[PDB]
Amino acid sequence: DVVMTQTPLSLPVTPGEPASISCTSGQSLVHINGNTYLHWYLQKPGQSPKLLIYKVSNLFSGVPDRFSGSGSGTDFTLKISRVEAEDVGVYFCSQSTHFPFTFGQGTKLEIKRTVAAPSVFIFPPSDEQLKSGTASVVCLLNNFYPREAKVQWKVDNALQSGNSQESVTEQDSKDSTYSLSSTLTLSKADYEKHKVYACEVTHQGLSSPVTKSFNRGE
Amino acid sequence: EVQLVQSGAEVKKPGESLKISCQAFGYGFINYLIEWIRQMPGQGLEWIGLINPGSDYTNYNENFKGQATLSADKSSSTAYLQWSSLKASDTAMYFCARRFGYYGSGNYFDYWGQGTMVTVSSASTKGPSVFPLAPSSGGTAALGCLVKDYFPEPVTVSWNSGALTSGVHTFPAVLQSSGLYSLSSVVTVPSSSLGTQTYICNVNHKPSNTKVDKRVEPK
Ligand SMILES: CCCCCCCCCCCCCC(=O)OC[C@@H](O)COP(=O)(O)O
């Protein structure tokens, strides 16, 4: 099949500046009929993709002329003359020259803003939950930028592994920040074995790692 | 305006089959080129195949041949996708789309169905438990609700019956090793309000007819 490779995987952009995204196909997209059926789509979270550019360079109806497409054979480029807030989401290249039709893996355009450190919060498990035989410990990283963040769980100074899961919000449309939750899950039997529960957060916005903790009880 | 309407969300067990529909509205269904494309968890687009209802023409992604069967009913203007021997990894949003006409036609369409969410799992319907994420420290405090151990997706969470939206973050669900989902919803509020203002998260899980209001208070 014709593999389509997109770069970069992520593109933080500041509104007003130009942007450019690349798509390479593992074989020529020039059809025997002379046309090149390479298209560009933009998808927003929770929605279907929407067509921006067809056959390399033709703007789909309604698409503003700040978008353009170029390239030939195997190498293709989508460009935005000056980025606007509305341009955010996942860009996919698409080929319909060769069956099976294929797609690139996507390039995510997000808003670049100044670095913002997370506000960190820890939540002990509730009495209610404990009664049912399980303990969830939640660590919240609120309103930070950029998305890269490290959360480590320490239980009585010991590093935890394989017992936590992380979840992340979509970039806030108004303040351009992310928020993140990390949830440590233990049996009630395992939770009452230890005292100190600690969430350690590493982020570009913080001078050094920040730790919130509680002692089981108090 | 041409529209494509797909059948409702499906929950299936491993090994079962499904058949989902894509209903067209407009004359000329027989000349359509209908494609099916699925999309995995915030992931890439996987092309399944294309069908022309006016002829025997079909083309299938080889990777799904003999799981997938595309068909069309010209009398009802409906296209169908059948998928046999479903696996957990077949969990995805399934779209039908009309994008192209015949080569040389000059036709570029961008008609997409609303998508059919398909969940494949051995799990049984179960409503969530809802636990408070209590605030503690005058600046701003965070609080929330942990919505644990439900199936299938989705749940909805509002605060104070939708009266509070500002500063709320409702995280995507994660699938636990038990096969049940879990999510948290948090809000940041003024510290000074904590003594006076009530905070209740309202959790609705339609697939189980579950409605839970959980009051979140300090201590
Ligand atoms: C006698 C043979 C008829 C049976 C053919 C049925 C299957 C047709 C498969 C066609 C795939 C079309 C993919 C595509 O990219 O279409 C673009 C066209 O929209 C417009 O083409 P153009 O821009 O006018 O060259």
Side-chain angles (χ1 to χ4, degrees):
Chain A
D1 310 344
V2 180
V3 188
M4 310 278 277
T5 304
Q6 283 182 255
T7 55
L9 310 175
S10 166
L11 188 67
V13 295
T14 311
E17 79 174 333
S20 178
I21 279 151
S22 171
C23 181
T24 296
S25 60
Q27 74 174 267
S28 177
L29 300 182
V30 182
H31 196 277
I32 198 63
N33 77 6
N35 284 342
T36 295
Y37 300 95
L38 183 281
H39 327 295
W40 289 96
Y41 284 85
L42 171 59
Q43 187 185 34
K44 277 133 178 176
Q47 300 177 13
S48 58
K50 289 178 83 56
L51 179 54
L52 302 180
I53 302 184
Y54 68 89
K55 283 195 289 191
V56 184
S57 65
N58 301 93
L59 286 192
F60 188 57
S61 169
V63 174
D65 67 19
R66 74 173 176 277
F67 289 88
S68 60
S70 55
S72 63
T74 51
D75 301 334
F76 302 93
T77 305
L78 169 43
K79 274 198 267 286
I80 306 168
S81 51
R82 291 186 73 205
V83 167
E84 308 195 348
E86 299 73 21
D87 298 335
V88 165
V90 179
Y91 288 81
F92 292 100
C93 58
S94 171
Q95 71 85 21
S96 55
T97 296
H98 305 278
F99 286 113
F101 293 169
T102 54
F103 294 94
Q105 287 327 109
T107 289
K108 189 177 172 194
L109 201 148
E110 61 142 3
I111 294 306
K112 190 199 173 77
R113 61 154 284 165
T114 57
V115 177
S119 294
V120 185
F121 303 86
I122 192 166
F123 305 93
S126 67
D127 293 69
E128 219 215 322
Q129 193 186 16
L130 288 175
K131 279 221 317 310
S132 78
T134 191
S136 306
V137 192
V138 178
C139 182
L140 167 69
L141 285 59
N142 210 47
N143 296 352
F144 61 92
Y145 187 87
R147 177 167 178 249
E148 187 186 331
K150 189 216 281 188
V151 180
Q152 285 198 343
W153 283 101
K154 300 264 178 178
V155 176
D156 285 335
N157 303 347
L159 190 267
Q160 297 302 116
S161 76
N163 51 191
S164 58
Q165 296 185 284
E166 283 186 8
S167 177
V168 67
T169 57
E170 287 310 293
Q171 187 169 44
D172 189 273
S173 71
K174 230 202 58 181
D175 74 18
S176 301
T177 63
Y178 297 92
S179 294
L180 187 161
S181 67
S182 178
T183 304
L184 175 68
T185 299
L186 302 184
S187 58
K188 178 204 177 200
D190 287 353
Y191 173 71
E192 296 284 339
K193 284 293 146 191
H194 302 291
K195 184 183 183 191
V196 183
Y197 289 86
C199 181
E200 184 194 76
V201 175
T202 293
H203 187 269
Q204 167 174 0
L206 306 155
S207 304
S208 67
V210 156
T211 299
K212 303 291 169 202
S213 65
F214 62 88
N215 309 307
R216 184 192 39 71
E218 290 183 346
Chain B
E1 192 205 318
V2 193
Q3 205 171 330
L4 295 168
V5 182
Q6 302 184 229
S7 49
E10 298 262 9
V11 193
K12 288 279 148 176
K13 291 194 147 57
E16 289 178 354
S17 299
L18 63 79
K19 188 174 197 176
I20 61 185
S21 62
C22 177
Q23 182 75 51
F25 313 77
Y27 285 73
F29 179 78
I30 55 160
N31 286 301
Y32 280 20
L33 302 180
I34 295 291
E35 295 168 78
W36 291 81
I37 298 162
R38 71 183 187 175
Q39 180 157 52
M40 340 287 297
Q43 205 150 358
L45 299 168
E46 295 191 326
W47 189 87
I48 299 159
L50 171 155
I51 181 166
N52 171 54
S55 71
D56 292 333
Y57 197 91
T58 64
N59 187 278
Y60 289 94
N61 182 340
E62 165 155 4
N63 298 313
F64 308 129
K65 76 165 197 164
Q67 280 86 56
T69 302
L70 297 195
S71 61
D73 183 355
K74 308 184 286 291
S75 69
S76 76
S77 302
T78 316
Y80 299 96
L81 172 64
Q82 280 162 114
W83 203 286
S84 60
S85 298
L86 285 161
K87 291 149 56 154
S89 72
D90 298 318
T91 297
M93 187 65 77
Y94 288 74
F95 294 103
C96 62
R98 180 182 173 216
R99 306 191 292 157
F100 311 116
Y102 279 39
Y103 287 116
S105 65
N107 292 329
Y108 294 87
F109 306 113
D110 194 39
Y111 305 125
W112 292 77
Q114 85 276 22
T116 296
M117 194 59 213
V118 170
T119 302
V120 189
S121 175
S122 53
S124 302
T125 308
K126 179 185 175 301
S129 294
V130 179
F131 308 112
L133 295 167
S136 54
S137 102
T140 41
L143 58 89
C145 285
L146 172 60
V147 185
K148 195 178 160 53
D149 284 349
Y150 66 94
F151 181 89
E153 276 268 67
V155 291
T156 58
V157 183
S158 57
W159 288 88
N160 298 343
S161 305
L164 176 67
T165 57
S166 283
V168 170
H169 291 295
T170 297
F171 292 91
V174 292
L175 170 75
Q176 307 159 106
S177 72
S178 69
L180 307 180
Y181 296 97
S182 181
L183 73 69
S184 272
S185 178
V186 302
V187 65
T188 55
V189 302
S191 296
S192 54
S193 59
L194 287 178
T196 326
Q197 259 271 8
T198 301
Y199 300 106
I200 302 161
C201 70
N202 321 104
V203 185
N204 194 4
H205 187 236
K206 169 68 192 180
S208 68
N209 308 309
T210 290
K211 299 195 87 167
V212 176
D213 297 335
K214 200 75 194 178
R215 189 182 203 216
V216 178
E217 51 183 46
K219 275 50 228 150

